Symmetry: C3
Subunit: 286 residues, 3 copies
């Protein structure tokens, strides 16, 4: 409901903003993908008159949605511009020194320091990254997370509209509870700016749960059913449903085709979360 320009976050933009990095060919034939990611302390107006003191990768919450193809060599040049030490811990296969865990290898990246995370894009699937500095709750909850999607080498069946949805919460008044919730950064954004999709088109959603404090989050779409692929790691779906649940760190792919035009609500099927920001609409054009 806070306008994107004022809030500092544009959830509509984030929805389809896949950062494929800058590519080059290695002397082995493989593709190299590179990103720069800077941790920066930044204020965000998440609700009318509510300023959230965030810790963010590249000045946005959620952080960049990284995209790679299975097998690619990856380099993430991380610079910490925050007042606190941070890391980037990737969900994916990598060496212990590349794990973003304090005490192992480079460990905590102090303010003003840099480090290059190197690993291969494996396994294929829908993953994520987040800070792993202790105390671990604030370092994730303050905004340090983003999507990491690895497309299978041979590719997936082609989608007409591919998007990313990161579910989070905002702890504004301290304690161990959330005051607001959102998809892609702003409470109620998609109520005022519905997700625009076309009738019958294959929609593919990478749904990632980063919600802290609360043990489980959920996702429901009105009038519609989707195939769900847990972690996006298998090519056949595990469920066909209208409601799925994810604990923190769980994620997957949903695929559907909207059979009818109009507005269809989507939201957490936990009522408390929906009424505090985690609700929106799809607007399906004929």
């Amino acid at each position: 409901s806070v306008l994107a320009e004022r809030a500092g976050i544009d959830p509509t933009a984030i929805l389809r903003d896949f950062d494929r990095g800058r590519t080059s060919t290695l002397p082995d034939g493989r593709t190299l993908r590179e990103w720069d990611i800077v941790a920066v302390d930044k204020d965000f107006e998440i609700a009318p008159g509510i300023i959230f003191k965030g810790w963010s990768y590249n000045g946005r919450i959620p952080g960049p949605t990284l995209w790679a193809r299975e097998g690619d060599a990856l380099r993430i040049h991380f610079t910490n511009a925050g007042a606190h030490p941070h890391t980037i811990h990737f969900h994916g296969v990598h060496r212990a020194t590349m794990d973003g865990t304090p005490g192992i290898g480079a460990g905590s990246i102090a303010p003003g320091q840099s480090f290059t995370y190197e690993f291969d894009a494996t396994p294929f699937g829908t993953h994520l990254y987040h800070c792993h500095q202790s105390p671990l709750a604030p370092h994730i909850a303050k905004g340090l997370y983003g999507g990491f999607i690895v497309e299978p080498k041979e590719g997936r069946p082609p989608a007409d509209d591919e998007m990313v949805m990161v579910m989070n919460g905002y702890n504004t008044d301290g304690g161990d509870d959330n005051e607001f919730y959102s998809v892609n950064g702003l409470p109620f954004h998609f109520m005022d700016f519905p997700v625009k999709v076309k009738q019958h088109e294959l929609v593919r959603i990478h749904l990632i749960n980063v919600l802290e404090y609360d043990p489980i989050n959920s996702f429901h779409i009105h009038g519609n059913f989707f195939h769900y692929y847990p972690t996006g790691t298998m090519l056949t779906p595990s469920e066909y449903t209208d409601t799925i649940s994810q604990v923190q760190g769980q994620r997957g792919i949903l695929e559907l085709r909207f059979p009818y035009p109009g507005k269809f609500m989507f939201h957490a099927h936990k009522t408390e979360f929906a009424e505090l920001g985690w609700m929106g609409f799809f607007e399906v054009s004929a």
Copy 2:
């Protein structure tokens, strides 16, 4: 004194367990079945625990509401009348047009006290579904009792069960706040302790299990001495799991299938102990 007797409580969970409402049917030009129900939202008091009177909002004067049953592809009409003091809707889990979704602000939206609306859609997809009110504030409109099961039988592929039943897991918020004071399957705390679910040894038992529990983020289901195949949302013909314990957040539901190998009493309850001890526990009684 035990669980509150059905006659006194105003809900009969045992009857609900096996009451699949097939509606009234007629044949369309095209060969398809037209299946119709009348559903009325009514404010009603229910004695859920001895001396504890829950002021419910109910469809057709029962909590859970009618368990609607259809066959895949049927044309459906639900003739809704709001006889309550507050605006209400019916939002179905199933495929339907936006104007038929029961969401305030979309199409007809909120149904005012005294007013009526016919929800129309096809019975699709096959599976185990549900319906509930979608009026804001969301929590009390579901938690006060406005929900029921909606079962769509596949046209092809599901072996006949010897005993088919429905179990709706809920909670009762009696004193305000964001917490439940009692829990039930099919309406009354501890009913199936006093009136165990009667099944036959070796017979195929098929349960449609639906979670509507508000406030608490997750519910579960465990059966003593037994294992079941579980079909999430009942939308697939092959089971996802073979287990004795499953979990569901609100809005999740599925089919359990089992055959009880031994006669006797077998407890079933939430494997969340708090819920079990506050009414979500019962027995199966397996006859030889």
Copy 3:
């Protein structure tokens, strides 16, 4: 973490201790497999200076990890040597009188009394047992639970390192909430004594959630992915992932091969649980 000798629990030993019990051959040719289990009250130092008044099976939390082959005839000879009535309720197929439920058959086993639970090892999978005396919460939460592993009749492809991990909590104080969390008995144990595994070898973990009060637990491993088999009841995996959730009573098998040497953290992806004890390392050689 508290050292194992002081604590009265050794999580490293528990990790690989599969109790196959005592076996004999029935006239049928079938295996009869038997265990003795005693409920005893015992104090455990779970955190520096924090003494937990436990109710334990055979003086350990978690209790013995029972192992059997599918189809075995089983007998568990139970004696209650505690101050409160107790039972053993098994997750597995059995007759109603063998269910360890108060009011059914022998029901509650009073202090000093004994009962032999008899059933077959069926179905194959990863299971558990725990007390079923009311009030239910303290009777599980005070320590009366353990693993029950039934191997399929034709077997599983062999693991290089097979282990059991029971996730729990400790309610040490007033309210019905947990103050500490662990895998296999001791908060943070595997931080100080990492799980030693070899690079590329098949690791099979029987992961069991017995956590009371909190509705759900989770498991995540850094830099690694595992195949997950819910309840261990199927020979094909349901998921390939790095994070899995279980409510109380849920359990499953995880299978993985570590492709790189070094230390890889494992812990609940519920942050509060990890920071209060449910955190460890794998040390890959």
